[PDB]
Every structure is written in structure tokens, then in C-alpha cells.
Amino acid sequence: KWTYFGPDGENSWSKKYPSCGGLLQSPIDLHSDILQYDASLTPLEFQGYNLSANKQFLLTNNGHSVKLNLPSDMHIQGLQSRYSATQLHLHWGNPNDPHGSEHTVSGQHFAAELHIVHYNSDLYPDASTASNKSEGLAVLAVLIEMGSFNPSYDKIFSHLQHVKYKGQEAFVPGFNIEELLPERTAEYYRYRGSLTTPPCNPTVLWTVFRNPVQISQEQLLALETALYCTHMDDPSPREMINNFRQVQKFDERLVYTSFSQ
Amino acid sequence: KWTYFGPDGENSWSKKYPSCGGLLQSPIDLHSDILQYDASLTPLEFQGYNLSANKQFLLTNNGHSVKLNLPSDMHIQGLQSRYSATQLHLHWGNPNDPHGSEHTVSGQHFAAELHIVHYNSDLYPDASTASNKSEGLAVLAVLIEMGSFNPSYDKIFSHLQHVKYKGQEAFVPGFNIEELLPERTAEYYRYRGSLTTPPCNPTVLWTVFRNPVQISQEQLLALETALYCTHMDDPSPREMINNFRQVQKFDERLVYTSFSQ
Numbered sequence: 474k475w476t477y478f479g480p481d482g483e484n485s486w487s488k489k490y491p492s493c494g495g496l497l498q499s500p501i502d503l504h505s506d507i508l509q510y511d512a513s514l515t516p517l518e519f520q521g522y523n524l525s526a527n528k529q530f531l532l533t534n535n536g537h538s539v540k541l542n543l544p545s546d547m548h549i550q551g552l553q554s555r556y557s558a559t560q561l562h563l564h565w566g567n568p569n570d571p572h573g574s575e576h577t578v579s580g581q582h583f584a585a586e587l588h589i590v591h592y593n594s595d596l597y598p599d600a601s602t603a604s605n606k607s608e609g610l611a612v613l614a615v616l617i618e619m620g621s622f623n624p625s626y627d628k629i630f631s632h633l634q635h636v637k638y639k640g641q642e643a644f645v646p647g648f649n650i651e652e653l654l655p656e657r658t659a660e661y662y663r664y665r666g667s668l669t670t671p672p673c674n675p676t677v678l679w680t681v682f683r684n685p686v687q688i689s690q691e692q693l694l695a696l697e698t699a700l701y702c703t704h705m706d707d708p709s710p711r712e713m714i715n716n717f718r719q720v721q722k723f724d725e726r727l728v729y730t731s732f733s734q
Numbered sequence: 735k736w737t738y739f740g741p742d743g744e745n746s747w748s749k750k751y752p753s754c755g756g757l758l759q760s761p762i763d764l765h766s767d768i769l770q771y772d773a774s775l776t777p778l779e780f781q782g783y784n785l786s787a788n789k790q791f792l793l794t795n796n797g798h799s800v801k802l803n804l805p806s807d808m809h810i811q812g813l814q815s816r817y818s819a820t821q822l823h824l825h826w827g828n829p830n831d832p833h834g835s836e837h838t839v840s841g842q843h844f845a846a847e848l849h850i851v852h853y854n855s856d857l858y859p860d861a862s863t864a865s866n867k868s869e870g871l872a873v874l875a876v877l878i879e880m881g882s883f884n885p886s887y888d889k890i891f892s893h894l895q896h897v898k899y900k901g902q903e904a905f906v907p908g909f910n911i912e913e914l915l916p917e918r919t920a921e922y923y924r925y926r927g928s929l930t931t932p933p934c935n936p937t938v939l940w941t942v943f944r945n946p947v948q949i950s951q952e953q954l955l956a957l958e959t960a961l962y963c964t965h966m967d968d969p970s971p972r973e974m975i976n977n978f979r980q981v982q983k984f985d986e987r988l989v990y991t992s993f994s995q
């Protein structure tokens with residue numbers, strides 16, 4: 474239907490998803506020439522991130538990433554409208570080239586990238602309806618690099634073996650999703666862009682935190698090697714690797730920063 | 735009517751040119767994880783590059799770049815067949831952002847890039863026929879950085895006001911094409927890839943020289959302001975700027991280097 478490789482990879486998405494060839498596409502390279510400090514960019518507030526340890530949240534392998542469903546009482550405060558959470562998921566490379574973030578900074582990929590997807594619940598009833606509408610979506614992006622073991626990311630990664638194949642689903646006990654955010658969340662890049670996968674709707678307000686998080690080499694290896702993008706009984710299995718989009722052209726536009734220094 | 739910007743830009747080329755969505759696409763980012771030294775990459779020799787100043791060669795704006803036609807007696811010695819020259823041309827950015835190379839190195843763009851296109855003349859009678867056969871083409875790529883004025887490049891650039899519009903033709907006296915190549919041509923990157931424009935045929939043996947050449951800011955500004963993709967009489971003119979493709983996924987390819995450090 475769509476993939477990140479072969480005949481149905483990214484250069485072919487615009488045949489069935491015309492917005493993939495339209496305006497405002499993400500991701501982009503965040504580089505100094507196009508950065509502009511904007512003192513209007515104040516800190517976001519993450520509300521309802523501390524998920525009940527008494528509730529369970531659905532983890533799925535959807536054949537393109539691993540996604541955790543989030544509840545709509547979790548939201549971002551600080552934007553014009555409230556944006557309520559719908560899901561999180563990740564993008565990564567492969568062990569021979571372990572640099573699979575979607576955004577780059579001064580031309581450099583990070584190892585991986587987490588996206589916490591929210592929709593404008595003041596204007597729209599659910600994420601599906603908001604997804605192709607004005608001001609519809611807001612995604613937070615965390616850049617990931619190898620470093621220290623990260624116990625919070627392991628609250629997700631410990632479940633990967635239960636969602637190895639496309640279609641499979643596991644339950645994850647609530648935990649504080651703010652633990653997956655980096656230091657100094659007040660420091661971020663902000664621009665108007667798009668979903669980085671089909672349908673590529675140009676309806677995303679991006680917030681990419683300035684500082685990366687760390688995960689260990691073993692945790693990064695697990696994320697790169699645990700999943701397949703095929704069904705369990707597919708006689709031709711494919712490993713889920715390199716599930717990021719290449720950077721798009723971004724011309725005569727700025728990315729605004731909440732930091733100058 | 736494919737372009738580098740807008741609805742007919744590069745995410746849409748695969749709608750009309752299926753090889754643009756196929757394998758083995760160029761350009762690519764040259765970075766350490768995918769480099770491997772190959773001691774079998776011996777030096778090329780450039781034969782018949784010193785074109786007579788008393789002869790003249792056709793310069794044409796083809797709607798996508800500016801190209802200089804080259805004579806078939808100009809050839810590369812050192813591949814497994816003789817490859818004869820057919821044309822050279824360039825890719826570049828724009829006046830406010832002079833960063834328009836096609837290949838990148840460790841995620842950074844150079845100002846511009848020169849391609850000297852050759853075809854297997856042992857097997858094929860012309861470059862068009864060669865272009866759709868396996869390793870039918872060999873392209874040399876020179877990375878261009880903003881630096882000193884370069885009198886040799888100016889033997890092309892001094893004619894740009896005479897090929898401003900699509901289809902226009904000018905004559906350039908012969909000069910020594912080897913003066914467009916960088917220092918230490920024995921140091922290069924080699925990989926199997928494709929044309930970087932439609933029809934994106936995967937039939938190119940690429941050689942990217944390790945070292946860049948320099949042209950001045952004034953020479954880049956001339957190149958970036960002289961030319962149009964449209965005909966002289968077109969009521970909707972379009973500036974020929976940013977005529978480079980984004981880098982492509984490396985579909986399990988390595989890039990081989992003739993230098994080990």
C-alpha cells in the first residue's frame with residue numbers, strides 16, 4: 474500500500490496520496506540559516522501525561538512503526554487551542570546505519586525520533602476528523618541518541634517482543650509520558666508542516682525539542698531489530714528498519730526557535 | 735513539465751517517470767557508515783579533455799540546467815569500457831541560499847555541482863541509447879564551494895546571458911575541461927546509481943571526486959540569476975534555481991572509496 478523501500482517507497486507516495494507532493498512537507502533540516510528566535514514561543518504544559526498505572530494502553534505494530542494509543546484527557550496547554558493526545562510512535566534506522574531520525578540538525582540525523590501526536594480537540598471531535606483540517610494536529614518530536622540506559626523508554630521497549638509482526642497488539646500499564654521528554658523542554662524549534670507519512674496532510678504544528686534524550690546501545694539495537702513490517706505468517710518477512718522519510722525542500726521559510734543562545 | 739518546485743516537483747516525478755520511484759536512485763549523502771575503501775579503484779585518465787580554443791561547442795539551456803555538448807573523442811580511460819563524453823551541466827541553489835549541490839558529504843551541501851556525462855561508446859553508438867542499459871553511463875561529479883574566482887568555470891559562465899531561456903543555444907570556444915576538475919582526482923567515491931532527473935534511469939556509474947573546487951560568490955550569483963526554465967516568450971516565467979534533487983535512501987548500497995583515510 475505504502476512502504477519506505479522498493480516500488481512503494483517515498484518517491485511513489487504522491488500517486489495515491491497527493492498531499493505527499495504538495496506544500497508544507499516534513500520533515501526538514503533544521504539549520505542555522507533558517508532559524509529565527511521568536512520570544513512569543515513560551516513553554517508548553519504537558520497535562521494528563523502521568524497516565525494512571527491502573528489503566529492499560531494499547532501498543533500496536535501497524536506495519537510502519539510501533540504505536541502506543543494515548544487517552545484524550547492527556548493534552549498540551551500553551552497553544553491557541555487545546556491539543557489532546559492520540560498516539561505516540563517512533564522512527565529509526567538500522568544497525569549498519571543507526572541514524573534514522575526524521576528531522577536533522579545542521580544536516581545530521583540523530584539515531585531515532587519519538588513523535589507524540591495530538592489533535593485540536595477544541596475545534597474537532599477526534600484525531601481522524603482533525604487530521605485533514607486547518608490547525609488540526611500538533612506533534613511533539615524528541616530526538617534520540619545513544620548514551621545511557623533509559624528506564625522510561627524501556628517502559629515501551631520491554632513490550633516490543635509482543636508486537637513483533639504487523640497487526641499484533643499488547644497492553645502497556647500507564648506511566649508518566651513526560652519522562653520521555655528531554656531536558657529543558659522550554660527550548661524548541663517550531664514550524665508549520667505535515668504528517669511525515671501518508672496521507673502527508675499539511676496540517677501539523679511541529680515542536681521539535683532542542684535537546685535529545687539518550688537510550689543505551691542495547692535499547693537502540695532492540696528497537697532496530699525487534700519488529701517486522703510483515704504479518705506473522707507472511708512467507709517473505711521484512712524487518713522494520715529505516716522507517717523515516719527523507720528531508721524535504723524548505724525554501725523562503727523560517728523555523729522559529731524559543732531559544733536564541 | 736517536471737520541475738524542482740511545486741506540484742510537478744520531485745515527489746511527483748514518479749507519477750510520469752516510474753524509474754524515479756525505483757531502486758538505485760541518486761544523489762546520496764556520502765557519510766562514514768556507508769563508505770568502504772576499495773584498493774581496486776585505480777586512477778582515471780582524462781583523454782581529449784583539452785578541447786581546441788579554435789573550435790566551438792554548443793551551450794544550451796535545456797529547461798532544467800545549462801549544458802555544454804562535448805565531443806565523442808573526449809573520453810575516460812580506466813573503466814572497464816571506454817566511456818566517451820556527451821555533455822556537462824550544473825546544479826545550484828539560489829541567490830539567498832547558495833547551497834545547491836546534489837550529493838552531500840556528512841549531511842552538508844556544497845554550493846553547486848558539475849556533472850560531466852559519459853556513455854559506453856564501446857557498446858553503444860550514442861548516449862541516449864546507452865542511457866537505458868546497465869552501466870551505460872558514467873558521470874563525473876565535482877563538488878563546488880564558494881571561494882576564489884575560477885577563470886576556467888568562467889569560460890562557461892561568461893556565456894550565461896546568451897542562453898537565458900529554454901531552448902536557446904550559444905557557442906563556447908574550446909578550453910581544457912580538465913581545468914574544471916579538483917586536486918587529486920585519484921581520490922574519489924564510486925557507486926552505482928541513476929540519473930538525478932527524469933527519467934531517473936538506474937544506469938549510472940557515479941564518480942564523485944573527494945575534493946571540491948571553488949568559484950566565487952559573484953560567479954554563483956551569475957549562475958543563480960541568469961537562467962529561466964521557460965521560453966523567452968512565456969507569460970509565466972520561472973527562474974532556474976534550486977535545480978537539485980534531495981538525497982535518496984541507500985537501498986543497502988555501499989559507496990566505495992579510492993582513499994582509505
Ligand SMILES: CCCSc1ccc(S(N)(=O)=O)cc1
Nearest residue numbers: 588590600604612668669670
Ligand atoms: C491523526 C493522524 C494519524 S496518521 C499519522 C501519520 C504520521 C504522523 S507523524 N510521523 O507524527 O507525522 C502522525 C500521525
Ligand SMILES: CCCSc1ccc(S(N)(=O)=O)cc1
Nearest residue numbers: 849851861862865929930931
Ligand atoms: C544521456 C542521458 C541524458 S539525460 C541526463 C539526465 C540527468 C543526468 S545527471 N544529473 O548527470 O544524473 C545526466 C543526463
Ligand SMILES: [Zn+2]
Nearest residue numbers: 562564588669
Ligand atoms: Zn512520526
Ligand SMILES: [Zn+2]
Nearest residue numbers: 823824849930
Ligand atoms: Zn546532473
